Write a protein that binds this ligand. Structure first.
Ligand SMILES: [Mg+2]
Lengths: 346, 452
DNA sequence: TATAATGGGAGCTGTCACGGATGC
DNA sequence: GCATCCGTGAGTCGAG
């Protein structure tokens, strides 16, 4: 029913490691990685492909999918070929395979055992724009990074090194996903810094600070305009479904006109404009009207050069320019005469 | 309705409360065999798919009542405060101390009254060496300094004049040594008193016996073989690289560690005994020790009558998953079925694809003639959907979404209002949730994330 | 990038009448 | 065969 409760149950299933269990798991993981590198040395194959194969057989055929980094599409066929190629190796070499498998299994068990930490850390990041479950999952990504990067040699407990990467992943998630209009992480940092600055400033000023005071507190490079524009780009959008009035019958979006699609008046005006332009062009001859329509783009929509209309009508560019000139001139005279195209000039 | 699944059940499968089984591979839960479209809980699916196991804590200072690799029956106490709830192969988890019994084969002399000595070509442990009517004083036949080495029972004397030993005497049970360590002894002074019956210790056996008769006494040169225990303490950051009861030689390492100076290396030939484990792991499994190269690696799943190790000699008994133990040099199969039980709309989509419509229509038609009113009712309600799909030409599995459509953007606008501020439809936020979660799903898959 | 850290947190309570699906 | 659960309905402009 409640997804969080359900997940907390599934997490409550796997029991917490002891110091020895943790050390052994980490050790098996590390030695497993070493073994994969060794198998890469021996076989002369790609360490990543080998890792994906070992992980494939450990996880089973329940999960097999093409890895973005891998060169070959990963399917039961290819993993069977590679597995059999790994079965083809001498006892001391074939040993490293077992080391690798044990490594993967240890990795899985390590993550699964440490899933609680992620929750305990993520519970404090709520209200920041991401759901609890999302924070948890991103934190889980962090946990995975921590597992693959851990060194048991340092004798530090796993939680210490894990927490760093977990917080890292949660915060990266918050910075990346939380805005309908996405903002770069460094810019989000600058914006939050501006917020904290303004909040401290207001905490000592007994009022909201001006742009100038914030600019002062931000240091050199920061003036009022920079603070103002930074606050401008930080603005988040508002819902079109935002309710208006105490009833349920009015949306905020109902008050917003469409500026894109031309109005009936605008359309009709463009129509009468085209018709009138044709009327005026019909007082010219075929050639000068056509030259004008070509140069101004009434024909294909593009505006032809003098050399194009000149090569089209078979005259010099000077000539075509001259007939364009006289065309425009006759149009000017007729326009002064009938005053027909004047009203379309606004 | 189509798949005959109650609302609660479909809720459970789609939302990942419960697994549903496809191609069960003959799993068994509580004595009852498993067939398709059965509803399995998490514990049930885990017991069936990954096998049944448990681990138990050992309070500080307490040792095991059982041995590593040893089969165990339910109810059998592994410790004074620990009883296993199941049957199977017990395994040691993180032994705190490792005892090494060191093999020593040496030569030691003794002198006894001829009347007392019982003549034998060899002496087994505990076997009486001699029977003495009166107290007898064993005396030193050499001069030098005394090295007294005391076993659990029985003793050794080594006389060294130059620091080079000139004598080795054996003192079986019943002989109380009259000398201390490092004592200076001249020739013919008593090193011991023998009283009543004297016999071989339980720790040491006499492999060979030579005897020289001189005067009224016999001098026995005994070729003896015995083991001397040495305890090693294992810290939590250390791991045991050696199996239970493994023959080791000088230079080999019993227990590794972070740094080489804290390592445990074997000083001499001896057998290894693992004591005081941090915890004990009871698994239902079949053990298969191997003397050579193994054909299957860790994680592979295998049926009875399958190749395991030694070029096809040792094979599989039960159904299970293969854990290859290099430390104990044994292939261990934890008993588990290969059963395929999925969750979510993927399972449902699979079952939907596997529905043959005409067949189900026939079934429901035969169901419509039943005397019961309720059965006819439900069969009618089902046959309505079945025939709806049949007549329409719609595939049932289309009720599951592989590809979620996306509305044209102008119908879910992002628009700058009068003041230059932005206003937008909620559908964008919904779609963003969707895409974030999907992408994170693809990345979690590609990176081989755990099942939870 | 390393001290250690390991199961969340509000509910919102004065209608109603129906229809249809589960449960004694 | 009959209690009880869940889902879904519950007026029109106008303005806000
Ligand atoms: Mg400034």
């Amino acid at each position: 029913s409640d997804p969080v409760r359900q997940y907390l149950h599934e997490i409550g299933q796997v029991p917490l490691l002891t110091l020895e269990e943790e050390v052994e798991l980490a050790r098996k993981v590390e030695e497993g990685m070493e073994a994969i590198k060794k198998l890469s040395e021996i076989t002369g194959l790609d360490p990543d492909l080998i890792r994906e194969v070992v992980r494939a057989k450990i996880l089973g055929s329940a999960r097999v999918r093409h890895i973005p980094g891998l060169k070959e599409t990963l399917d039961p066929k290819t993993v069977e070929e590679i597995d059999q190629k790994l079965k083809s190796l001498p006892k001391e070499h074939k040993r490293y395979l077992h080391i690798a498998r044990e490594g993967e299994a240890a990795r899985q068990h390590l993550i699964e055992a440490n899933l609680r930490l992620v929750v305990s850390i993520a519970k404090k990041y709520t209200g920041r724009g991401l759901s609890f479950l999302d924070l948890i999952q991103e934190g889980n990504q962090g946990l995975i990074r921590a597992v693959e990067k851990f060194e048991y040699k340092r004798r530090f407990k796993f939680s210490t090194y894990a927490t760093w990467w977990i917080r890292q992943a949660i915060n990266r998630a918050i910075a990346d996903q939380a805005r309908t209009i996405r903002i770069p992480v460094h810019m989000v940092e600058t914006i939050n810094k501006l917020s904290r600055t303004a909040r401290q400033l207001q905490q000592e000023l007994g009022r909201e600070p001006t742009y100038e005071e914030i600019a002062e507190a931000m240091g050199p490079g920061w003036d009022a305009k920079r603070v103002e524009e930074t606050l401008k780009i930080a603005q988040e959008p508002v819902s079109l479904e935002t309710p208006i009035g105490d009833e349920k019958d009015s949306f905020y979006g109902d008050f917003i006109p469409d500026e894109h699609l031309p109005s009936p008046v605008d359309a009709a005006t463009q129509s009468l404009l085209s018709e009138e332009l044709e009327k005026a062009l019909s007082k010219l001859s075929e050639r000068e009207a056509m030259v004008l329509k070509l140069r101004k783009g009434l024909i294909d929509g593009r505006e032809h050069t003098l050399e194009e209309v000149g090569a089209f009508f078979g005259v010099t560019r000077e000539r075509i320019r001259q007939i364009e000139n006289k065309a425009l001139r006759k149009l000017k005279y007729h326009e002064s005469r009938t005053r027909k195209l004047r009203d379309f000039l606004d | 309705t189509l798949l005959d699944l109650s609302a609660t059940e479909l809720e459970q499968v789609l939302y990942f409360s419960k697994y549903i089984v496809l191609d069960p591979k003959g799993a068994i839960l509580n004595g009852v065999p498993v067939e398709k479209r059965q509803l399995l809980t998490d514990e049930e699916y885990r017991e069936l798919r990954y096998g049944k196991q448990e681990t138990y804590p050992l309070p500080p200072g307490v040792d095991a009542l059982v041995k590593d690799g040893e089969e165990v029956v339910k109810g059998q106490e592994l410790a004074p405060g620990v009883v296993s709830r199941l049957d199977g192969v017990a395994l040691y988890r993180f032994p705190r101390r490792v005892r090494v019994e060191y093999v020593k084969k040496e030569r030691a002399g003794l002198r006894l009254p001829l009347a007392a000595w019982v003549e034998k070509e060899a002496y087994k442990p505990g076997e009486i060496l001699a029977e003495l009517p009166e107290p007898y004083l064993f005396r030193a036949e050499e001069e030098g300094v005394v090295e007294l080495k005391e076993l659990e029972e029985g003793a050794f004397l080594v006389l060294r004049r130059e620091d080079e030993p000139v004598a080795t005497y054996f003192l079986p049970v019943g002989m109380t040594p009259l000398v201390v360590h490092g004592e200076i002894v001249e020739k013919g002074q008593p090193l011991a008193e023998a009283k009543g019956l004297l016999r071989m210790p339980r720790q040491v056996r006499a492999a060979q016996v030579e005897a020289e008769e001189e005067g009224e006494t016999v001098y026995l040169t005994l070729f003896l073989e015995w083991t001397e225990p040495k305890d090693y303490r294992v810290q939590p950051h250390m791991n045991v690289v050696v199996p239970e009861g493994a023959r080791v030689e000088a230079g080999d390492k019993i227990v590794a560690a972070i740094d080489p100076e804290e390592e445990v290396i074997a000083e001499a030939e001896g057998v290894v005994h693992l004591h005081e484990p941090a915890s004990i792991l009871v698994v239902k499994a079949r053990v298969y020790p191997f003397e050579d190269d193994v054909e299957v690696s860790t994680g592979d799943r295998v049926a009875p009558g399958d190749v395991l190790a030694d070029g096809g000699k040792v094979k599989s008994d039960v159904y299970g998953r293969v854990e290859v133990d290099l430390v104990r040099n044994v292939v261990r199969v934890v008993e588990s079925y290969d059963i395929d039980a999925r969750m979510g709309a993927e399972a449902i989509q699979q079952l939907l694809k596997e529905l043959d419509l005409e067949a189900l229509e026939k079934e429901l038609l035969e169901e419509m003639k039943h005397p019961s009113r309720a059965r006819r009712a439900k069969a009618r309600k089902r046959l309505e959907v079945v025939r709806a799909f049949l007549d329409s030409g719609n595939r049932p599995e289309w009720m599951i979404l592989e590809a979620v459509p996306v509305l044209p953007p102008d119908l879910r606008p992002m628009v700058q209002v009068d003041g230059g501020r932005f206003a937008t439809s909620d559908l964008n936020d919904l779609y963003r949730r969707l895409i974030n979660r999907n992408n994170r799903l693809k990345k979690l898959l590609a990176q081989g994330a755990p099942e939870i």
